[PDB]
Amino acid sequence: SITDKDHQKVILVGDGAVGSSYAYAMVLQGIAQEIGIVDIFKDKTKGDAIDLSNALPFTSPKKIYSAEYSDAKDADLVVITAGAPQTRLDLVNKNLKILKSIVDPIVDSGFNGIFLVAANPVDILTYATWKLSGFPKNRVVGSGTSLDTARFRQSIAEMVNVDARSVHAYIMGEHGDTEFPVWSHANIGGVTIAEWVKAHPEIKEDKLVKMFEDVRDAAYEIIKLKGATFYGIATALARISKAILNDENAVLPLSVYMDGQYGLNDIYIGTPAVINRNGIQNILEIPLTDHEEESMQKSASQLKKVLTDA
Amino acid sequence: SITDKDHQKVILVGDGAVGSSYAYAMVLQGIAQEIGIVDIFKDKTKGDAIDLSNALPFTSPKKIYSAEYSDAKDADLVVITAGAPQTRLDLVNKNLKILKSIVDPIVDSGFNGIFLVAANPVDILTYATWKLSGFPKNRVVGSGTSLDTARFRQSIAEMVNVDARSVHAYIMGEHGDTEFPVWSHANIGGVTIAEWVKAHPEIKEDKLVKMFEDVRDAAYEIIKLKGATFYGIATALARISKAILNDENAVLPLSVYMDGQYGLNDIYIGTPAVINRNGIQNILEIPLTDHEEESMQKSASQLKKVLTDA
Amino acid sequence: SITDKDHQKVILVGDGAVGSSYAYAMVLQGIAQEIGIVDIFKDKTKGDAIDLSNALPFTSPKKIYSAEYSDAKDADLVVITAGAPQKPGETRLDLVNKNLKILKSIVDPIVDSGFNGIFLVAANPVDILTYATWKLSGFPKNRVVGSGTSLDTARFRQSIAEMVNVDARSVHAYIMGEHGDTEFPVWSHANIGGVTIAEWVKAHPEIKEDKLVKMFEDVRDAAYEIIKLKGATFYGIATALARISKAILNDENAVLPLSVYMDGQYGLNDIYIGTPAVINRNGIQNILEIPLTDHEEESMQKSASQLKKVLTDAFA
Amino acid sequence: SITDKDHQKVILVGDGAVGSSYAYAMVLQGIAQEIGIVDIFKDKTKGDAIDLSNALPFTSPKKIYSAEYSDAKDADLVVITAGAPQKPGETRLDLVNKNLKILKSIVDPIVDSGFNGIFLVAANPVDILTYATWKLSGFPKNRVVGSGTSLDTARFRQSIAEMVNVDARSVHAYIMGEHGDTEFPVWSHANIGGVTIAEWVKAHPEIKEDKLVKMFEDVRDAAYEIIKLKGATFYGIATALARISKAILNDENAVLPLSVYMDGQYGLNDIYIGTPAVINRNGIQNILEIPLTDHEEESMQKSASQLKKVLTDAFA
Ligand SMILES: O=P(O)(O)OC[C@H]1O[C@](O)(COP(=O)(O)O)[C@@H](O)[C@@H]1O
Ligand SMILES: O=P(O)(O)OC[C@H]1O[C@](O)(COP(=O)(O)O)[C@@H](O)[C@@H]1O
Incomplete structure (x- = not known):
């Protein structure tokens, strides 16, 4: 059936205040049917997935879980919020090593959707994301x-x-x-x-x-x-x-x-x-x-x- | 891109008060991104598509149009409201000739989604729809x-x-x-x-x-x-x-x-x-x-x- | 309690395709908590109130009923919809005068109810009947509004x-x-x-x-x-x-x-x-x-x- | 005008993770039209009011601000969230007494404002502080509510x-x-x-x-x-x-x-x-x-x- 593809899936990278709040917004507004949360701190993501799931009886349903880069295989959307804070060129280089460690395994998963980038500095890391991912220009987007x-x-x-x-x-x-x-x-x-x-x-x-x-x-x-x-x-x-x-x-x-x-x-x-x-x-x-x-x-x-x- | 399939499409058959109201409900609630309206009366459907489109600046967007059975090729959902009113067996036979004239061309389009049946008498025409379409049991559904x-x-x-x-x-x-x-x-x-x-x-x-x-x-x-x-x-x-x-x-x-x-x-x-x-x-x-x-x-x-x- | 005022009430005048569809839009979007439907045809409004109520278990709740002008006493909003249409014989002035007799027979009893809310006018011809509604109601300019x-x-x-x-x-x-x-x-x-x-x-x-x-x-x-x-x-x-x-x-x-x-x-x-x-x-x-x-x-x-x-x- | 009452106002007491998240939920779902945020930490509430306001162009509008107990005068709803937590030394009775001193310092000024709405209590321990809120406020039973x-x-x-x-x-x-x-x-x-x-x-x-x-x-x-x-x-x-x-x-x-x-x-x-x-x-x-x-x-x-x-x- 064609409708087997009416299931929308987001992988969030970064479960700090931004990412956690994003997820909560998605929950309340009933946007997407699945959210996988990926972060170095696996215990935090597990806890957030539970806490966010507790809201669902008051909204539309969702599968929510602590996730791994490999869960991006069939995702619609990859949202990157994992930004190391602050020379400007040092800031960039630091965030490039981290960004590469995210983007490469996501691409290796088979992910074939859209990248949405919010990590600071956003315009630069958006460009870096495009460069690293090899995706088309129009499928890498920054919050700008x-x-x-x-x-x-x-x-x-x-x-x-x-x-x-x-x-x-x-x-x-x-x-x-x-x-x-x-x-x-x-x-x-x-x-x-x-x-x-x-x-x-x-x-x-x-x-x-x-x-x-x-x-x-x-x-x-x-x-x-x-x-x-x-x-x-x-x-x-x-x-x-x-x-x-x-x-x-x-x-x-x-x-x-x-x-x-x-x-x-x-x-x-x-x-x-x-x-x-x-x-x-x-x-x-x-x-x-x-x-x-x-x-x-x-x-x-x-x-x-x-x-x-x- | 995988997200090229994040576009949901409904074909409505029957633009009487039920179907027209259904469409309006879908518009207001922002459910699906496309509604094709099919009915013997092509002028009525053209008019409704326009009238319904006039609402869209106050809701989420949608492509809405007077449609043909062949537009079901890539639809998620086919909603059948076209029911000829009233022996009970006569009523059924009458509605079977009409239903066949709808279902066959829809199947011939390549439609590979879910049938949702509301035409009266609904349980019977739901069974008839399954029988005519050759679709699986779980993908033919009546409003019951x-x-x-x-x-x-x-x-x-x-x-x-x-x-x-x-x-x-x-x-x-x-x-x-x-x-x-x-x-x-x-x-x-x-x-x-x-x-x-x-x-x-x-x-x-x-x-x-x-x-x-x-x-x-x-x-x-x-x-x-x-x-x-x-x-x-x-x-x-x-x-x-x-x-x-x-x-x-x-x-x-x-x-x-x-x-x-x-x-x-x-x-x-x-x-x-x-x-x-x-x-x-x-x-x-x-x-x-x-x-x-x-x-x-x-x-x-x-x-x-x-x-x-x- | 101050929260006794957290109940919003609309009186709709005119249960033609416009008014009925309005009401349905309000139902689906969960807009006020009460809709009273007023029309010369009482049976139509009774039937609509029921048919609209059937939708409520899928949406937020509402009291919906066939209503009378006197039910506007404590309404937030009075929505006027059913203009008598122009007949092929008539001048624009004729259309206006015809609709003024009707409009007066609506606005006066509504005002007499004690209604103290906002008038929302959609009846054609809308800008004129908005003015007429202001003139008839005696309400302030900013509390009579047309869909324009x-x-x-x-x-x-x-x-x-x-x-x-x-x-x-x-x-x-x-x-x-x-x-x-x-x-x-x-x-x-x-x-x-x-x-x-x-x-x-x-x-x-x-x-x-x-x-x-x-x-x-x-x-x-x-x-x-x-x-x-x-x-x-x-x-x-x-x-x-x-x-x-x-x-x-x-x-x-x-x-x-x-x-x-x-x-x-x-x-x-x-x-x-x-x-x-x-x-x-x-x-x-x-x-x-x-x-x-x-x-x-x-x-x-x-x-x-x-x-x-x-x-x-x-008006002369 | 009667519609001057169609403005719903919530006063939130407590701007910790619960209160802040509540406010955000109200913002995204478009629930009331005004949220005043009250907490001992005035800078936190100022910052939250701004950060929450930044969301408003994507949602329905709201007046949001750092607030004081006296702003409850005309509020529909007072939401109480930040219970002082139990320290490892203390008995349950100690926890209660501690939270009663604090709760009184909130409820009394709110009542003095003229607030005449509903109390919604979420502070832990919730059933107890709901009772205490009823007892302190003097409000009717049915207008003091806990999240339970x-x-x-x-x-x-x-x-x-x-x-x-x-x-x-x-x-x-x-x-x-x-x-x-x-x-x-x-x-x-x-x-x-x-x-x-x-x-x-x-x-x-x-x-x-x-x-x-x-x-x-x-x-x-x-x-x-x-x-x-x-x-x-x-x-x-x-x-x-x-x-x-x-x-x-x-x-x-x-x-x-x-x-x-x-x-x-x-x-x-x-x-x-x-x-x-x-x-x-x-x-x-x-x-x-x-x-x-x-x-x-x-x-x-x-x-x-x-x-x-x-x-x-x-209470003895
Ligand atoms: O589908 P059912 O069996 O009637 O329940 C549907 C209803 O359940 C609810 O969750 C509320 O019911 P309860 O609160 O008693 O559980 C609503 O969200 C929904 O409209
Ligand atoms: O995206 P833009 O250029 O700011 O417009 C977005 C806004 O436009 C609106 O349609 C209203 O703007 P106008 O009513 O002046 O046209 C809202 O629906 C929406 O929030």
């Missing part, structure tokens, strides 16, 4: 600025008192210090922020600048206050997972392979893209202001120098 | 008493003022005049109706009898009041569709093939069963009282005489 | 979505004006993931200007096409009504295209007309004034002008 | 589900008593699609009586196992709390196993203990008295008796 974008929208939403789902604004570039806001195209119900400020002059230019600074530095603030950041990215990863598994052709800001867009080549970087069951379908090229295009070039340039050196 | 059961639960729920999802009661047998309630196992939060009546003697025995009579005759009442019945069965069909497509192993009352259960053989009849992506996994055999087992035998016997004659 | 161009907007987005092969939730485009023949598309602000249709066409010159014009014409005329093919249109508006209902009942501050009262916006006054607006538990919070091109602003002025002449003539 | 054996019950169902390979939503089995070492399974009424486990074992004699005993032991001891493997347990109870929260806020009349006040049921009095009960916007509506076997009724009596001795000793 999906979270920064969410943070940006929520910030705007709170300022104007509107549901964030009605706010449309991007953060683009390499996720990190060099990312930038696309104010030229940011809007609320089609009314741009430039037009919004006209109609509501209480909103000072300097508020908007600070708003983006707060977004860019949001991880530092959250870590300072509570030790770690995880609910945002977990929620984003589940959103991306759903777009793939329900074949949505949704537009999301993701780390995607650059083949000419924005005058860039041979890096993964953050931009809006269309995604479905087969991964990336279209890379959307927002036409940026000169100011904005300069930010993109700088972000890309610095990123590319590090990859080449790496 | 899923709707009668829902009606029963809601009736009880209203009487005791409790959420129907907390009421557990079955109607079994052949869907129609000979179906019967399983009071022996019916309960609310594990407290049986027999035990409930003990604790709440306001509930008269004669109320319960009438309650089941009202259930058995519910279609006649609804038709008399508003011309047709459709929201219940559409909702049930969508529930069954979800159990299959999300591989739930849910327990539902369905028309399933009898291989010894209740001392019955070689008919489709209504009983609780476990269902998932591969259709029927287990037929549950409720142990009935003598009174209840007699009702099952009679229901089955009459049904079997009609099939044999047919 | 929410459906036309959905149709527009889905059309674009299909052309570019993208999830319509990722397409952001409005139809504005009076819902009907004089409505118009806001191409200047329409976009897909922030890339405008003007910018999209630059990158994809296969997309001919004429395709876009026709695409909007097909949207404007969509009801005629659907009615011709299957007799009636209902799934789109029912779904929209349920979406608006959810924005109110879950206090969302969602931006939707709705028929809202005009107090200067677009250089218009004292009509209800279609534009994006922010809506929550208290009804309309902000009317968004999209800054239009000259061409687009002209369409809005014409739509408004014709609408206003009819209202003025109607 | 809702989680143990979930664990039990999932265990059975896994053994028989069936969706746990199709498994109907309770754990009852005081949540903890003295709780017990109700095999007599446990079933899968109406077929009892006694009847299931008849049809499937592979299933050994000893497997079932161990299955319950594993459930009873599940917290110890999970804590041993990963340090803490939280996803199960958070999910349960969100389920109970939804039953209240959507006025469901759902049947759940909860810690409820005993007024004769099972021949018990004046304790909170775990049994199925019907719950809606006004809290507890019916306590369901499952008729137990002699063996099962004995377990309930023992569980209750030990619990009652501790409460009596505690």
Whole structure:
């Protein structure tokens, strides 16, 4: 029967706060029917699989378990959250040894699905994942600025008192210090922020600048206050997972392979893209202001120098 | 890529009030990613496909269209609602000529999924569908008493003022005049109706009898009041569709093939069963009282005489 | 207890294909906890209440019943759906007057019940009967709401979505004006993931200007096409009504295209007309004034002008 | 406007792994519209409010913030989570007394705020602190609710589900008593699609009586196992709390196993203990008295008796 393939399977690599939260999000929202959890700490994963399974009588069912790389053989989706924290080039090299020890055995399993990469530094490790896996460009995807974008929208939403789902604004570039806001195209119900400020002059230019600074530095603030950041990215990863598994052709800001867009080549970087069951379908090229295009070039340039050196 | 198969496709046969409502239910609940609508009246289906597509910006996306039997080639699910209304043997023979004109071209398409049958008379046309299609027993499924059961639960729920999802009661047998309630196992939060009546003697025995009579005759009442019945069965069909497509192993009352259960053989009849992506996994055999087992035998016997004659 | 108020109640007026389908949408999505159905045809509503109730064991619970205007006393929401349709003899003014007699016979008893909630109007012609509902009810402007161009907007987005092969939730485009023949598309602000249709066409010159014009014409005329093919249109508006209902009942501050009262916006006054607006538990919070091109602003002025002449003539 | 009340507000007390996870569950499932987070550690709550807010553009909106007891004034729901844990030196009575000082310092200011909603208690030891919360708050019995054996019950169902390979939503089995070492399974009424486990074992004699005993032991001891493997347990109870929260806020009349006040049921009095009960916007509506076997009724009596001795000793 053809319907024997109506069983969706995710392998999660990394059972820290991000991965564990991701899994919980998938459980509550009933996305996928199987989650295998892989981590160096086998006892932690066993415990989490049980704790997560305890939730299932209140949601749709799932097979959940402590897993091994070899369980990726027939998986739809491999989600990588296992990122060693911090020179930048040292950080990269350290995470490359670890990433290779994950990707190689996964490929050897026979895995033939989509890689979703969230480990920091995400754009770089997305490129590294593509390079190591030998998979096509469109089937290796990074979370990129999906979270920064969410943070940006929520910030705007709170300022104007509107549901964030009605706010449309991007953060683009390499996720990190060099990312930038696309104010030229940011809007609320089609009314741009430039037009919004006209109609509501209480909103000072300097508020908007600070708003983006707060977004860019949001991880530092959250870590300072509570030790770690995880609910945002977990929620984003589940959103991306759903777009793939329900074949949505949704537009999301993701780390995607650059083949000419924005005058860039041979890096993964953050931009809006269309995604479905087969991964990336279209890379959307927002036409940026000169100011904005300069930010993109700088972000890309610095990123590319590090990859080449790496 | 393996994820190229994360696209779920339903072909609906019959675009009357039942089928149209089913489709709407699937749209709102975001179940499946494609619905092809097939009916003799091509203009009606074209119109419905458009009207249903107009809803999609408020839900998850779907490809929806007026379709042909040949579009079942790669479908997960074929839902048959096309039932000519009313001797009983005449009714059957009439619906068999029509059913054959549907099933044969669907099989010829290469369809290799699950048949879900709702056309009346459902248990008989479920058997006929199995016989005509040549598919395995567990991949031809009828809606059976899923709707009668829902009606029963809601009736009880209203009487005791409790959420129907907390009421557990079955109607079994052949869907129609000979179906019967399983009071022996019916309960609310594990407290049986027999035990409930003990604790709440306001509930008269004669109320319960009438309650089941009202259930058995519910279609006649609804038709008399508003011309047709459709929201219940559409909702049930969508529930069954979800159990299959999300591989739930849910327990539902369905028309399933009898291989010894209740001392019955070689008919489709209504009983609780476990269902998932591969259709029927287990037929549950409720142990009935003598009174209840007699009702099952009679229901089955009459049904079997009609099939044999047919 | 304060939580005694955590029970949401909708009174639906009109149990035709729109109202019935609305109710079904509310049932499946679990939106309020009580739906009373009111219509001249009491048997129909009794039958629908039962048929809808049959769905409840698969969804969250609800009290559903055939209802009377007096049941609006403590309702959150009154949804009005069944406009008397235009007969081939009649003028637009005739259609309005006919529907005003009927509308009054609904709104007055509802107000007399003590109802103190929000009116959601979908009956055609919607912008006019939204105004009439405000005028008859005496309620505040922001607590009388029409569905306006929410459906036309959905149709527009889905059309674009299909052309570019993208999830319509990722397409952001409005139809504005009076819902009907004089409505118009806001191409200047329409976009897909922030890339405008003007910018999209630059990158994809296969997309001919004429395709876009026709695409909007097909949207404007969509009801005629659907009615011709299957007799009636209902799934789109029912779904929209349920979406608006959810924005109110879950206090969302969602931006939707709705028929809202005009107090200067677009250089218009004292009509209800279609534009994006922010809506929550208290009804309309902000009317968004999209800054239009000259061409687009002209369409809005014409739509408004014709609408206003009819209202003025109607109430005299 | 009456719809000004269509804004649901939860105050969470305790921002440990349970409370935080609860809040996240409420966010993802779109349950109330406002969550105020209260904890001795103000920086933690500020950070969580932000981190949770980051999720909102993917879900329905919510106002989320670091909060104070006085923010309970107009709350629907107060959820209490962070019991001070038992130190290796201390008696059960010591644990209770310690948690009573703390609980009082929470409940009194909440009551003083004007809060007039429902208390949902999850702090361990839950049945006792549910009673203490009732006693301290002065609220009615049916508006103070503990999570009781809702989680143990979930664990039990999932265990059975896994053994028989069936969706746990199709498994109907309770754990009852005081949540903890003295709780017990109700095999007599446990079933899968109406077929009892006694009847299931008849049809499937592979299933050994000893497997079932161990299955319950594993459930009873599940917290110890999970804590041993990963340090803490939280996803199960958070999910349960969100389920109970939804039953209240959507006025469901759902049947759940909860810690409820005993007024004769099972021949018990004046304790909170775990049994199925019907719950809606006004809290507890019916306590369901499952008729137990002699063996099962004995377990309930023992569980209750030990619990009652501790409460009596505690309040003197
Ligand atoms: O993906 P984008 O460009 O931000 O748009 C996503 C959002 O669009 C929406 O459809 C609403 O936006 P608009 O209503 O202005 O079109 C939501 O469904 C969704 O959360
Ligand atoms: O399929 P059955 O036998 O009626 O049970 C289905 C129902 O069981 C439930 O889990 C609740 O029933 P209980 O809470 O008594 O176990 C619901 O999730 C679901 O609607």
